[model samples]
Target: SKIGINGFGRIGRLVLRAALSCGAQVVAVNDPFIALEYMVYMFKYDSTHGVFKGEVKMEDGALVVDGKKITVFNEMKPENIPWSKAGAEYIVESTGVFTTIEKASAHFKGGAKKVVISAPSADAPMFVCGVNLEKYSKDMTVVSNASCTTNCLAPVAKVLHENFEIVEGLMTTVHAVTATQKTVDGPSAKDWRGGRGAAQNIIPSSTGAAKAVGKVIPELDGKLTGMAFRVPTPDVSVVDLTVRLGKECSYDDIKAAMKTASEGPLQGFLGYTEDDVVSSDFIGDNRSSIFDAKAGIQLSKTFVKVVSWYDNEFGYSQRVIDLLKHMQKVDSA
Candidate 1:
C-alpha cells in the first residue's frame, strides 16, 4: 500500500516507521508547522522509542530514510496536499484536526482513494484491528482507528464477552501524558485539569474508550463506561478493567481464555504476559494490549479485574498500519 501521512507528529512519524518495516510505501508526508529538516531529525531520533536505527537525511527537498525518498509538503489544508503527485492512494490522517467525516473527506478530493483517521470520530466508522476490522468494506472511504485506549480495551473485552460473557464493565486507564496535556501550569479552556503540570500530578480526566468499544463490539453497547488518569509518564500506559461476567469463571479460566486468543486468532494484535513487568517495560511494544496475567484477579464468581499495557504511541501507530494494509487488501479485491 502506497500511503501518505497528513501530520508528522508522534503517531505520524511512527506510522511511517512501521510502514517501512512492514514493506508499505510511505510516499508522502505533510505537516504545516514542522520544517522538513526537523521532520528528518525527529524521525531519526525519538526520545521514547530510541534511535530509529536507519539512515536518515534530507535530499532535494524530500526526507530520505533508508534509501527511500518521501515527498514532503507544508500544506495546511487537507484538500491542498499533493497526495496524487507521489501516488499515495491511502492517506493516514494523524493530524487529530480533520477528525470528522466532513472534515477528513477533503483527502478524497486531493486524489486519495481512502483516508484512515488516527483518532476517534463520532461520524466515521471506528475499527479496532483485532476486534472489528472484518467489518471494513471497500465503500468505507474514511475510517477511524479509534483511540489507543479503545484499541487496548476492545480486544480483551471481546475475548471476555465471547468466552465468559461481559454483563457490564468499567475501565480506568493509567495513561501517559500526551501532547494535549500541559507540561506546566497553564490555562486550558476546555479542561482545567489538563492545564495543571503533567508530570507533577495524577490528573483525572474522561475517556470515551469504554463507549467506543460498543462501536466495534456491538454486544457491549452501553454496557461499559470509563475514565482516565494521566500520570507522569511519557510513553507506556495500562488499562485497569473491572467487569461483571454473566458466567462463573476462575482466575485460571480467564487466563486460559486470554492466552488462547493471544496464541490463536489475536496472535499479533493481542499479547499475553506472565512476567512481573511495569509500564516502561512496554515502551516499544506493538501489541494493542498485553494481558498482564500476574495482575488479573477473580474476586468472586461474577467479579473480575484485569490489566493490560500498551505503548500508546508506537503500538497505536502499528495498528494504523495494520488497518491501512487491510484497507488496501479490500480495495485490491
Candidate 2:
C-alpha cells in the first residue's frame, strides 16, 4: 500500500522510515521545508535510527530513501497534494498541527482514503493499541494515534479494566526525549521553561491524553488524568500510573496479568519485558507499547507504575497503518 506523509519532524520522518520498513511505499512527502540537509547528515551520523538502508540520496530533485524519498511537493494545505496519482490509499498527516474531522477530510480530497494524526487534538477519534479497539470499524477514517504517552499507557489501562476494574487513576509519565521540546531555552511559548534545553532540564509539561482519551475508551477515558515530565535524554519515555482498582490486588497478580496480555493476542504489537530494558535499548525496537515487566506495583500497591518504552514514531506509525487500512473501507476520493 502507498501512503503520504506531511512534515518530516521527529515523528514524521521516523514514521516514513517505519512505513518503508513495513513494505508500504510512501507515495509522497509533504514537507514544504523539506530539504536534503538533515537526510544527508543523519546518513553519516545517526546510524542507530537508520532502520532502513541507503536513506540518503538525491534523485530528480527529490530526496531518495526508498518509500519516503518521493516527489517533493510544495503544498501548504492538505487539499493541495494530488495523492491519487501516487496510488496512496492512506495519508499519515504527522504535521502535528491538524486534528479535527473536517481538517482530516481535506487530506483525503487531495488523495487519500484515510488520514491519521500523530498528535492529540480536540474531541476526535483516536487509538492506542490495547486501550479498547472493539469500537474499530473499518469505516473510521480520521484517527489520531493518540500520543507517545497514550501509546505507552493503553495496555496498562486495558489490563486493569479486565482484571480488577480500574476505578480511577492519575498517570504521570516521566518521559525522555522529544523533538517537540526545544533544544535550548529560547524565547518560546508561554511555558518557556519546558522550551529550555532538554539535555539539561526536568521540564514540567502538559499532556492531553487523559482528556482526549475518552474518544477511544468511552468507559475509562474520563476516569484518567495525565501529566508529562521531559527528562534529560534523547530517547525512551516512561509511564507511571496510580490506579484505584475496584478491589485491592497483589503486585504479583498485576504482573501476571500484564504477562498474559503481553503474551496474548496483543503480544507482538504490545509486550511485557522482565529484564530491565533501558532507553537506548529501544532505539530501533518497534512495538506499540513495551511494558517494563520489571516495573510493577509500588507505593503500597495503590499505584501500578509502568516503565514502558517505545520508539514513539515506530509505535505511532503502526497505528497509522491500521487506521489507514480501516479508512479504505468506505474511503471514496
Candidate 3:
C-alpha cells in the first residue's frame, strides 16, 4: 500500500513505524508545525516506545528510513498537500483536527483515493478491525477508526453480545493522559478539569467509547455507556466493564468464550491472559484489548464484571494499519 500520514504526532509516527514493520510503503508525511529534522528525530526516538528499530536519516528534504525515501510536506490546508507527487493513494488522517467528513474529504482534493480518520467522527462511518470492518465498502471514502477506547471496547463487546447477549452495560476506562491534558494548571474555558496539571491529578473526563460501540455493533448501540478517568500515566489503560447478560452464565463460561475468540478469530486484535498483570506490563502490547481472565467475575447469573488492558497508542496504531490493509483489499476486490 502506498500510504501518506497527514499529521506527524503520536498516532501518525506510530502508524509509520507499524506500516514499515508490516511492509507498507509510506510515500509521504505532512505536518504544518514541526520541521523535517525534528520530525525525523521524533520518529527515530520516542519517549514511550523507545528508539525506532531501524535506521533513520534525512536527505533531499525527505525522510529516509532504512533506505526508503518518504516525501515530506508542511501544507496547512489538506487541499494543497500534493499527495499525487508521492503517489500516495491511502491517507491516514491523524491530524485530530480534520475529524468531520467534510473536512477530511480535503485529502481527496489533494489526490488521495481514500482517507481514514484516527479519531471518532460524527460524520464519517466508523469501523473497528475485528468487529465491523467486513462491512466497509469501496464507496466510503472517508472512514473513522474511532477512538482508542472504542477500539478496546468493541471487540470484547462483540464476544459478549454474541455468546451471552449483553442486556446493557456500563464501563469506566482508567485511561492514561494524552496531549489534550494540560502539563500545568491553565485556563481551559471549555473543560475546567482538563486545564489542571495532568501529571499531578486524576481527572474525570467524558468518552464516547460506550456509545460508539453502537456504530460498529448495531445490536449494542444503546446497550452500553461509559466515561473515563485520566490518570497520571504516559501509556497503558484498562477498561472496567460490567454488563447485564440476558441469559445466565458463569465466570468460566465467559472466560472460555473470550479465550476462544482471542485464540481463534480475534487472535492479533484481541488477547486473553491468565497471568497477574498491571497496567504498566502492557506498555508495548499490540493487541487492542487483552482480557484479564483473573479479573473476570460473576456477581450473579446475569451480572458480570470484566477488565481489559491496552497500550492506547501502540495497540490503536496497529488497528489503523489493519484497517488500511483491509481498505486496499476491498478496493482491489
Candidate 4:
C-alpha cells in the first residue's frame, strides 16, 4: 500500500523524493497552506538549499515525476484530504509542526492507518531506524522518526546501554545551520536569546533530540540528556557524544562494544571507524552515524566519544521510508 503525507517542506518533500526513488508509491500529499504558486516554485526550487528542478507534471490528476504518476493533494487538514479515497494506509508528517500524538492521530481520523513524524517529538513514540521497528502497529498508528541527530545518536547509546549500564551521558550535536536560522545576526528572544548571525554564529540552541534518543532506547532513558549547536556550515550535522560508562573501560572495549552493537540490529545503518576524521568525511554518508571507533572510552568513564553526521533532510527522509516499511510489516503482524 502507498503512504500518506502532510507538508511538502524540507523533510516532507525529501521523503517524497526518496519514497519514489525507492519504489514506494506516494498515495496522498497535503500542504493545504502553501500557495500553488509557491508550491510549484518550491517543486522547481527546493527552499532548503534553493536548489531547483525542471520537471513536475500533472497527468491524469496525479503529479508525475519524470512521468511517473503520483498523487499530490495541496490541501490543509489531513482529515479533509480523505486518505481513504487515495487508498493510502500510512502517513508521514514532515511539516516540523504538530508534535503531539493526539494531533497525529487526528490526521489519521482524516484518512490514514498510521502517521510518522519527520521531527523529534517527545510527546509521541520516538523511533530510530533499525532500533525498534516492531514497537509500532496499525492500532498504535502514530510514530516519530526522531530527528537526524537522534538517529545519529541513539544506536550508539544503545550499544553502551546494552553492554554496560549507561549510568548517564550528555550529547552535543554540532549540527549544521538550518534554513530557519537567520543569514545574518537578527533579533531573537526565546532559547537562543543572545543569537549571533545564523550564517556566522556557531549558535547553541536546545536539543530535544538528545533527550528524545532515550525514547528510542528506553534502557537509556533518564540516563541520557544533551543539547545542540548549529555551526556555520550548511549541511551535515555531527554528534559529539560522551557516554559515562558504569565501569572503567578502554578504547578497545568501547570499539568492541560498538562492533558488537552494530553487528546485530544496527549493521547497515551504523558504520564504525578507527582512522582520524572530520565532518567533511560524512558529507553524503548515509549510515545513522559513523562511529569514531578509535574513540575508545577515556578515563574509565567509558567516555566513548563518537561522531555521527547526516544531511538532516536526507537522512531523516530515509528513516521515514525505513519506518514506514517497518510499520507495514508490523501491521501485517
How do the residues 1-333 of candidate 2 rate in per-residue lDDT, one tens digit apiece?
A: 667777666766767666665656666776766565555454334534653455567777777764345755557787867777766666777776677777777776766676677777565577665653656555676777677677777766777676787787877777776766777777557877766887888888788556545566678758888788888756666677777777677766777887887878668667777777465477567777777766543645655555566666466666666555544543534
Per candidate, the number of residue pairs that clash is 0, 0, 1, 5
Backbone clashes in model 3, listed as residue pairs: 214-221
Q: Rate the local accuracy (lDDT) of all candidates.
A: 0.85, 0.67, 0.85, 0.69
Q: Once superposed on the true structure, which residue ranges of model 2 sit more than 4 Å away at CA?
A: 36-48, 66-69, 108-113, 277-280, 299-303, 325-333
Give the RMSD in angstroms, all C-alphas superposed, for model 3: 1.3
Candidate 1: C-alpha RMSD to true structure equals 1.3
Better candidate number, 1 or 2, judged by TM-score: 1
Model 2 clash pairs?
A: none
lDDT score for residue 242 of model 4:
73
Consecutive 10-residue window with the lowest summed lDDT within model 2: 39-48
lDDT of 1 by residue, 49-92 (tens): 87776769989888889987889888778788886776888888
Per-residue alpha-carbon lDDT of candidate 4 for residues 1-333, written as tens digits (9 for 90 to 100): 578777787777767777866767756667767744455556666544445453665657556566555567765565566777777777888776677787777776665666787776758777787666666666666777777777877777777666766687787877787667866766565645335587656677777644566577775566677888887776777777776677667756777777766676688777777775555566545457767765432444465565656667576676678877877777765
How far off is residue 6 in model 1, in Å? 0.3
* Pairs clashing within candidate 1: none
**Ten consecutive residues with minimal summed lDDT in candidate 1?**
293-302
- The digit string of per-residue lDDT tens for model 3 on 1-333 reads 688999788999988999988878777999988988998788899889888856588998788888888998998899889877778888899887899999998887767768899888888989889875777888888888887888888888988878889998889998898888989989778988989999889888888755569888887778888888999888988888898898788877888998999989988888988876565689988779888888644467788898888899899888899888888888775
Point out where model 4 deviates above 4 Å.
33-55, 60-62, 187-196, 295-301
